Amino acid sequence: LDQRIQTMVYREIKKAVEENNAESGTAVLVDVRTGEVLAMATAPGTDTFEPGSTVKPFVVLTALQRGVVKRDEIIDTTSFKLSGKEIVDVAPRAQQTLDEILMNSSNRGVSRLALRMPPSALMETYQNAGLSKRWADIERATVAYGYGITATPLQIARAYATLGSFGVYRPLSFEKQDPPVIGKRVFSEKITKDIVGILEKVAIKNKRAMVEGYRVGVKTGTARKIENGHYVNKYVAFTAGIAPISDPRYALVVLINDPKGAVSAPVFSNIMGYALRANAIPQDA
């Protein structure tokens, strides 16, 4: 825990909450190299939510890792239905690359990849990243766009730390810690490095989360809050990401409850900076 950073996170969240007149916000900064929680801060008047788009990079990872898609493959992102429910896209296209699916955050892109794979495939991938009898065709899809499932910011932070280490799952430490650290390798180095690459492109196309000096990789989404074991028709904005792309040091999750839409992105950019610039992390942009 960096108190210089923790005090800065606690201020940045307050601004974001009161500025967006949100019900509450949360931010978590995990050190990629050690798994120590550098900053954890919440603006009272860590609750669970739907991971949503945050899981999508892990679906592309899994599909490449399973060899059920070729890296340069064009996916059919034209409308379709599973168990009678239509898969909807925010930014529909006809044909998408894997790069475009994370970039366009297409539910269809990821839904198709899931149905190229046993349901076990994504379930192993979530368990590995720490997000922890025959499946209906819609259930096989929703999980792939992180609908119908639960998560916490620390869970997303760790997960995103697992990208940063290029596939090495290091458990979270509250206690101060120094490299090197024992950690189970759970994802291909080459393919995780590559997804972090695609995350960069997401960060670029959505300018609001980028950081002056540094290269920053991010996923940004909306999903239902999960109160007392159920989904309530109340929204959460999150951006999750790692930086600096070239040698990741920080996994950061930002969550704001009930903003009153790319509103968590600029809160990431500010906290990712004051953290990188405050610990003298060589620029790479």
Side-chain angles (χ1 to χ4, degrees):
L1 189 66
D2 260 313
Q3 215 78 31
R4 293 180 300 288
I5 293 177
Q6 171 68 356
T7 61
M8 191 60 77
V9 175
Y10 186 35
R11 291 291 300 216
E12 270 303 323
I13 199 64
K14 275 176 207 176
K15 286 185 193 169
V17 187
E18 300 206 43
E19 277 192 276
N20 299 111
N21 189 34
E23 179 179 79
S24 60
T26 287
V28 180
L29 187 80
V30 159
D31 175 339
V32 160
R33 281 167 172 186
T34 55
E36 59 196 335
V37 175
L38 292 189
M40 183 196 302
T42 191
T46 58
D47 281 22
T48 57
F49 71 108
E50 277 188 327
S53 285
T54 54
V55 307
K56 278 166 173 153
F58 293 93
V59 172
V60 185
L61 199 158
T62 293
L64 280 168
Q65 185 163 300
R66 288 304 194 99
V68 302
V69 63
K70 289 193 64 175
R71 176 71 192 91
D72 282 310
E73 189 170 341
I74 309 173
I75 301 285
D76 185 346
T77 54
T78 299
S79 50
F80 75 108
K81 300 161 137 178
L82 302 169
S83 318
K85 192 213 274 189
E86 194 203 341
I87 310 305
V88 178
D89 269 8
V90 179
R93 304 297 297 289
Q95 265 189 348
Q96 285 191 133
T97 59
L98 292 182
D99 311 322
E100 284 159 19
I101 285 159
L102 300 193
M103 310 217 65
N104 296 344
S105 186
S106 79
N107 284 9
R108 276 165 206 155
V110 285
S111 303
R112 278 192 203 281
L113 292 187
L115 290 161
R116 279 185 199 219
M117 298 190 275
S120 55
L122 282 174
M123 293 320 272
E124 290 172 31
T125 293
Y126 298 179
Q127 282 156 35
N128 289 351
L131 297 164
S132 56
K133 186 145 166 273
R134 278 192 197 176
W135 280 55
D137 276 16
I138 184 60
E139 201 169 344
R140 276 159 63 114
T142 44
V143 168
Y145 58 92
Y147 180 107
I149 48 164
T150 201
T152 64
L154 279 71
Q155 289 186 334
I156 301 303
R158 172 164 64 194
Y160 269 75
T162 311
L163 297 193
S165 57
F166 310 132
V168 187
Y169 170 94
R170 310 197 171 111
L172 300 177
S173 204
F174 292 143
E175 290 299 336
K176 282 175 200 174
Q177 277 271 63
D178 280 287
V181 165
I182 292 168
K184 181 192 199 311
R185 159 159 298 280
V186 299
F187 307 136
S188 158
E189 198 169 356
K190 297 182 181 300
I191 291 148
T192 294
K193 193 139 202 287
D194 195 353
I195 280 143
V196 174
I198 315 184
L199 280 186
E200 190 169 22
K201 303 164 140 189
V202 166
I204 286 160
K205 183 183 171 181
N206 294 13
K207 303 176 168 198
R208 319 208 202 166
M210 305 199 75
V211 171
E212 188 157 9
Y214 303 90
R215 307 155 74 171
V216 164
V218 155
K219 196 68 180 82
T220 294
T222 309
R224 305 157 322 176
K225 197 181 161 193
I226 290 173
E227 285 169 11
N228 176 51
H230 294 76
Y231 306 79
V232 301
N233 275 0
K234 267 165 65 202
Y235 297 90
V236 176
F238 48 72
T239 72
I242 51 172
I245 287 282
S246 68
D247 169 42
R249 302 295 297 275
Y250 302 129
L252 169 51
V253 176
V254 171
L255 185 153
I256 286 157
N257 298 320
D258 205 358
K260 294 176 178 188
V263 191
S264 60
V267 182
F268 183 100
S269 180
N270 296 343
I271 299 178
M272 191 47 87
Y274 295 110
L276 289 155
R277 285 196 276 273
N279 278 359
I281 315 300
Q283 293 177 6
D284 61 311

